[PDB]
Scaffold this active site. Structure first.
Site, PDB file in Angstrom:
ATOM      1  N   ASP A   1       0.864  -1.264  -0.120  1.00 15.12           N
ATOM      2  CA  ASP A   1       0.046   0.074   0.088  1.00 15.12           C
ATOM      3  C   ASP A   1       0.818   1.197   0.026  1.00 15.12           C
ATOM      4  OD1 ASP A   1      -2.962   0.891   1.929  1.00 15.12           O
ATOM      5  OD2 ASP A   1      -2.311   1.475  -0.001  1.00 15.12           O
TER       6      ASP A   1
ATOM      7  N   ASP B   1      -6.114 -10.516   5.144  1.00 13.32           N
ATOM      8  CA  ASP B   1      -7.261 -11.298   4.899  1.00 13.32           C
ATOM      9  C   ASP B   1      -8.723 -10.697   5.364  1.00 13.32           C
ATOM     10  OD1 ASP B   1      -5.735 -13.151   3.228  1.00 13.32           O
ATOM     11  OD2 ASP B   1      -5.819 -14.597   4.804  1.00 13.32           O
TER      12      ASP B   1
HETATM   13  N1  LIG Z   1       2.057   7.997  12.536  1.00 10.62           N
HETATM   14  C1  LIG Z   1       1.412   8.823  12.148  1.00 10.62           C
HETATM   15  N2  LIG Z   1       1.813  10.313  12.524  1.00 10.62           N
HETATM   16  C2  LIG Z   1       1.062  11.419  12.146  1.00 10.62           C
HETATM   17  N3  LIG Z   1       0.024  11.215  11.173  1.00 10.62           N
HETATM   18  C3  LIG Z   1      -0.436   9.992  10.974  1.00 10.62           C
HETATM   19  C4  LIG Z   1       0.381   8.971  11.183  1.00 10.62           C
HETATM   20  N4  LIG Z   1      -0.393   7.659  10.686  1.00 10.62           N
HETATM   21  C5  LIG Z   1      -1.315   8.027  10.014  1.00 10.62           C
HETATM   22  N5  LIG Z   1      -1.651   9.291  10.188  1.00 10.62           N
HETATM   23  C6  LIG Z   1      -2.385  10.230   9.517  1.00 10.62           C
HETATM   24  O1  LIG Z   1      -3.652   9.748   9.679  1.00 10.62           O
HETATM   25  C7  LIG Z   1      -4.655   9.628   8.311  1.00 10.62           C
HETATM   26  C8  LIG Z   1      -5.476   8.392   8.164  1.00 10.62           C
HETATM   27  O2  LIG Z   1      -4.505   7.216   7.984  1.00 10.62           O
HETATM   28  P1  LIG Z   1      -4.825   5.712   7.401  1.00 10.62           P
HETATM   29  O3  LIG Z   1      -3.623   5.145   7.354  1.00 10.62           O
HETATM   30  O4  LIG Z   1      -6.021   5.319   8.347  1.00 10.62           O
HETATM   31  O5  LIG Z   1      -5.498   6.198   6.209  1.00 10.62           O
HETATM   32  P2  LIG Z   1      -4.765   7.001   4.830  1.00 10.62           P
HETATM   33  O6  LIG Z   1      -3.367   6.378   4.831  1.00 10.62           O
HETATM   34  O7  LIG Z   1      -5.335   8.172   4.910  1.00 10.62           O
HETATM   35  O8  LIG Z   1      -5.738   6.203   3.449  1.00 10.62           O
HETATM   36  P3  LIG Z   1      -6.248   4.692   3.515  1.00 10.62           P
HETATM   37  O9  LIG Z   1      -7.331   4.598   4.673  1.00 10.62           O
HETATM   38  O10 LIG Z   1      -6.831   4.666   2.232  1.00 10.62           O
HETATM   39  O11 LIG Z   1      -4.763   3.918   3.831  1.00 10.62           O
HETATM   40  C9  LIG Z   1      -3.382   9.880   7.040  1.00 10.62           C
HETATM   41  O12 LIG Z   1      -3.659  10.606   6.239  1.00 10.62           O
HETATM   42  C10 LIG Z   1      -2.035  10.353   7.992  1.00 10.62           C
HETATM   43  O13 LIG Z   1      -2.277  11.764   7.616  1.00 10.62           O
HETATM   44  C1  LIG Z   2      -2.169  -5.536   6.554  1.00 13.12           C
HETATM   45  N1  LIG Z   2      -1.845  -4.366   7.437  1.00 13.12           N
HETATM   46  C2  LIG Z   2      -0.803  -4.422   8.542  1.00 13.12           C
HETATM   47  O1  LIG Z   2      -0.248  -5.509   8.574  1.00 13.12           O
HETATM   48  C3  LIG Z   2      -0.498  -3.247   9.084  1.00 13.12           C
HETATM   49  F1  LIG Z   2       0.568  -3.332  10.227  1.00 13.12           F
HETATM   50  C4  LIG Z   2      -1.034  -2.068   9.155  1.00 13.12           C
HETATM   51  N2  LIG Z   2      -0.743  -1.031   9.985  1.00 13.12           N
HETATM   52  C5  LIG Z   2       0.445  -0.550   9.959  1.00 13.12           C
HETATM   53  C6  LIG Z   2       1.669  -1.214   9.590  1.00 13.12           C
HETATM   54  C7  LIG Z   2       2.964  -0.501  10.037  1.00 13.12           C
HETATM   55  C8  LIG Z   2       2.916   0.306  11.124  1.00 13.12           C
HETATM   56  I1  LIG Z   2       4.902   1.396  11.544  1.00 13.12           I
HETATM   57  C9  LIG Z   2       1.806   1.169  11.522  1.00 13.12           C
HETATM   58  C10 LIG Z   2       0.598   0.563  10.851  1.00 13.12           C
HETATM   59  F2  LIG Z   2      -0.377   1.126  11.242  1.00 13.12           F
HETATM   60  C11 LIG Z   2      -2.054  -1.927   7.735  1.00 13.12           C
HETATM   61  C12 LIG Z   2      -2.900  -0.777   7.689  1.00 13.12           C
HETATM   62  O2  LIG Z   2      -2.447   0.299   8.427  1.00 13.12           O
HETATM   63  N3  LIG Z   2      -3.807  -0.585   6.770  1.00 13.12           N
HETATM   64  C13 LIG Z   2      -4.387   0.311   6.556  1.00 13.12           C
HETATM   65  C14 LIG Z   2      -6.002   0.583   6.844  1.00 13.12           C
HETATM   66  O3  LIG Z   2      -5.965   0.500   8.346  1.00 13.12           O
HETATM   67  C15 LIG Z   2      -6.595   1.967   6.252  1.00 13.12           C
HETATM   68  O4  LIG Z   2      -6.866   2.978   7.652  1.00 13.12           O
HETATM   69  C16 LIG Z   2      -3.969  -1.714   6.035  1.00 13.12           C
HETATM   70  N4  LIG Z   2      -3.418  -3.032   6.268  1.00 13.12           N
HETATM   71  C17 LIG Z   2      -2.567  -3.206   7.270  1.00 13.12           C
END
Ligand SMILES: Nc1ncnc2c1ncn2[C@@H]1O[C@H](COP(=O)(O)OP(=O)(O)OP(=O)(O)O)[C@@H](O)[C@H]1O
Ligand SMILES: Cn1c(=O)c(F)c(Nc2ccc(I)cc2F)c2c(=O)n(C[C@@H](O)CO)cnc21
Ligand SMILES: [Mg+2]
Length: 291
Positions: A130, A157
């Site tokens: 991703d 999954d």
């Molecule tokens: N470790 C972090 N520190 C600061 N901001 C974060 C962190 N992780 C995520 N974010 C913010 O939170 C938002 C939501 O993240 P999330 O991974 O749920 O979805 P996304 O990456 O925006 O899109 P998708 O849900 O389609 O993966 C992101 O746009 C990012 O800006």
């Molecule tokens: C399979 N998997 C994952 O295995 C997974 F670990 C994931 N998260 C993750 C991995 C590494 C680190 I550093 C921080 C994270 F939040 C993860 C994941 O964040 N997403 C995104 C959705 O929650 C959208 O909001 C999808 N799959 C994940």
């Protein structure tokens, strides 16, 4: 120390995506500020134990190109993943404010992404799955880091049902079947760079007229475009030919013909960008307003 729900306290919400919400939180016993991601899953205890079990490998992820991990647990119907708080947010948020991201800066972004994927493959035998601008986080120290990579099979999954009904960064091969691997990440990186470079999701490409001005689509329509119609490219002239070549090598439809990490590592663009003197940290703060 082990992290648990009552040891936290919400500060603010950092954003949400599909299937997850992320809070900026204070972990009371340590005083540390963290980013707590919640994934709402209702699923049998047996497998949600497996998920928390599989997620503990993130303790072995130590890399300057990967977001720090503090721990994972299960709460009131939610999987918690606690990361380092990146105070500059994600590159999709940065592009949002910045409008369009300079080539020199994208050069440093590519280095971080490449070395990041390299670490994950080398030290952990995993692909990302991703790669997109919202999954490349940056901070006021000037660090560029990947997150949201797929460490847990059972999680992958248990999430297969949802996804994004617009804008795909998925490779043509991933869209067409189950036959994909690390090469698919190269396609998403390529697409992300083109987006950041131009200031909007690059499919479909801009008209001749939309271009000179710069300087909705249906699901099947968009996907059909990724699969069958020629890949997107950088507008000519206003980006160096090293950078154009770089994305071209990333955006080759055929996964085996397509450049790989070891080849991109030594591309003229990376070699040029490794040398360049760039105040990334300074550019970040000056654009998004930090200190
Ligand atoms: N470790 C972090 N520190 C600061 N901001 C974060 C962190 N992780 C995520 N974010 C913010 O939170 C938002 C939501 O993240 P999330 O991974 O749920 O979805 P996304 O990456 O925006 O899109 P998708 O849900 O389609 O993966 C992101 O746009 C990012 O800006
Ligand atoms: C399979 N998997 C994952 O295995 C997974 F670990 C994931 N998260 C993750 C991995 C590494 C680190 I550093 C921080 C994270 F939040 C993860 C994941 O964040 N997403 C995104 C959705 O929650 C959208 O909001 C999808 N799959 C994940
Ligand atoms: Mg994400």
């Amino acid at each position: 120390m082990e992290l648990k729900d009552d040891d936290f306290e919400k500060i603010s919400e950092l954003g949400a995506g599909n299937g997850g919400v992320v809070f900026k939180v204070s972990h009371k016993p340590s005083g540390l500020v963290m980013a707590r991601k919640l994934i709402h899953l209702e699923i049998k205890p047996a497998i949600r134990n497996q998920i928390i079990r599989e997620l503990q490998v993130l303790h072995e992820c130590n890399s300057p190109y990967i977001v720090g991990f503090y721990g994972a647990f299960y709460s009131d119907g939610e999987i918690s993943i606690c990361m380092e708080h990146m105070d500059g947010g994600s590159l999709d948020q940065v592009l949002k404010k910045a409008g369009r991201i300079p080539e020199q800066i994208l050069g440093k972004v590519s280095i971080a992404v490449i070395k990041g994927l390299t670490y994950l493959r080398e030290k952990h035998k995993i692909m990302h799955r991703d790669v997109k601008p919202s999954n490349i986080l940056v901070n006021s120290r000037g660090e560029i880091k990947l997150c949201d990579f797929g460490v847990s099979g059972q999680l992958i999954d248990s999430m297969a049902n949802s996804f994004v009904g617009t804008r795909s960064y998925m490779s043509p091969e991933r869209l067409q079947g189950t036959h994909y691997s690390v090469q698919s990440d190269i396609w998403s990186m390529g697409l992300s760079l083109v987006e950041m470079a131009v200031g909007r999701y690059p499919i479909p490409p801009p008209d001749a007229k939309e271009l000179e001005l710069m300087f909705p689509m249906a699901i099947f329509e968009l996907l059909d475009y990724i699969v069958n119609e020629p890949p997107p490219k950088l507008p000519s002239g206003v980006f160096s030919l090293e950078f154009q070549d770089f994305v071209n090598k990333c955006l080759i439809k055929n996964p085996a013909e397509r450049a790989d990490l070891k080849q991109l590592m030594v591309h003229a663009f990376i070699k040029r960008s490794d040398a360049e003197e760039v105040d990334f940290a300074g550019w970040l703060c000056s654009t998004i307003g930090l200190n």
